[PDB]
């Protein structure tokens, strides 16, 4: 890491996992492989955000919102619900203890568990209301790679808000529960719930 000693005592520990690999608060960001079709670009994992904060300027463009980090979309959907419908610092620190549980359980890359937690968690086909005869019956349609990531982190936060609501269960505990139940299909997260019936219709109405 090439020795650095001057006036202000910069801990060589912080300079270690920083002045070399600018990953997370000590989380290997490098490597990672695509386990599904496309998702590239609409799913970052190439911009090593050390913290959960950034100068968010992506909603000012249609697809530049997709080129936005996938880890940032998580704390964006976490910084809401009346009391905290704003203020990012809150969800930011509690989001640290979440991927730290995943650090002890299966370790891997914290960002690798979130990749499977968007591949088979983002609704393949969302149901919309279309006409036919007698009344108006709903019908789903193929969803794009961007609406799989978008609609995913949206339901992922609904099952985590009702998980830390009326339940002694803490935030980082329910946020880890959300990423872990999103291992590859546990049928426990509120997210998979609504998606399961989107496939129910994306079958008997194809």
């Amino acid at each position: 890491f090439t020795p650095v000693v001057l006036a202000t005592p910069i801990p060589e520990e912080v300079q270690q996992a920083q002045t070399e690999i600018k990953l997370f608060n000590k989380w290997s960001f490098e490597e990672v492989e695509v386990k599904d079709a496309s998702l590239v670009d609409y799913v970052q994992v190439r911009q090593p955000i050390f913290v959960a904060h950034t100068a968010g300027r992506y909603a000012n463009k249609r697809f530049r919102k997709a080129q936005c980090p996938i880890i940032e979309r998580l704390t964006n959907s976490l910084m809401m619900n009346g009391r905290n419908n704003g203020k990012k610092l809150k969800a930011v620190r509690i989001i640290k203890h979440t991927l730290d549980i995943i650090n002890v359980l299966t370790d891997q890359n914290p960002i690798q568990v979130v990749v499977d937690a968007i591949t088979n968690t983002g609704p393949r086909e969302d149901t919309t209301r279309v006409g036919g005869g007698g009344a108006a019956r709903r019908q789903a349609v193929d969803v794009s790679p961007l609406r799989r990531v978008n609609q995913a982190i949206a339901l992922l936060t609904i099952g985590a808000r009702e998980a830390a609501f009326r339940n002694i269960k803490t935030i980082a505990e329910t946020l880890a529960e959300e990423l872990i139940n999103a291992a590859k299909g546990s049928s426990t997260s509120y997210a998979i719930k609504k998606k399961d019936e989107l496939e129910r219709v994306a079958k008997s109405n194809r």
Binding site: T8, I10, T19, N25, H53, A55, L89
Partner: protein, 141 residues
């Protein structure tokens, strides 16, 4: 006199003035390091620039940072953009042009307004609410 390239950094409505002279390389804010600014998580967010390059070019310059007014979080992006624009200024005043060339190319290949300018600021609140376009709940009757 003392050779210091005085610069600055701010956002929304805050104040920060950073200096980059020829000294023993430090980062004291009125006499405190950037490694104690808090809020713990935003502390690692302000080191980020000194990570993709390394505090190796910061082992030969005295940084004099100071912040007042605005907001606590608004000062976060303030202190970092004041010393980032201050170092690139020492590479145009006491360093060569091709060195400062791949320096700013390492900031725009990540882009976080370190040297650029943020043009976002509060709008003209309307005569009906607390925000801009915001209009009172018009339930008609």
């Amino acid at each position: 006199a003392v050779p210091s390239v005085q610069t600055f950094g701010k956002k929304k409505s805050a104040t920060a003035v950073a200096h980059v002279k020829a000294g023993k390389g430090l980062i004291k804010v009125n006499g405190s390091p950037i490694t104690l600014v808090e809020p713990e998580i935003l502390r690692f967010k302000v080191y980020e620039p000194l990570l993709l390059v390394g505090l190796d070019k910061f082992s030969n310059i005295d940084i004099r940072v100071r912040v007042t007014g605005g907001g606590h979080v608004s000062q976060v992006y303030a202190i970092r953009q004041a010393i980032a624009k201050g170092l690139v200024a020492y590479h145009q005043k006491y360093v060569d042009e091709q060195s400062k060339n791949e320096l700013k190319k390492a900031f725009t290949s990540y882009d976080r307004t370190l040297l650029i300018a943020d043009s976002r600021r509060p709008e003209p609140k309307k005569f009906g609410g607390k925000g801009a376009r915001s209009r009172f709940q018009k339930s008609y009757r």
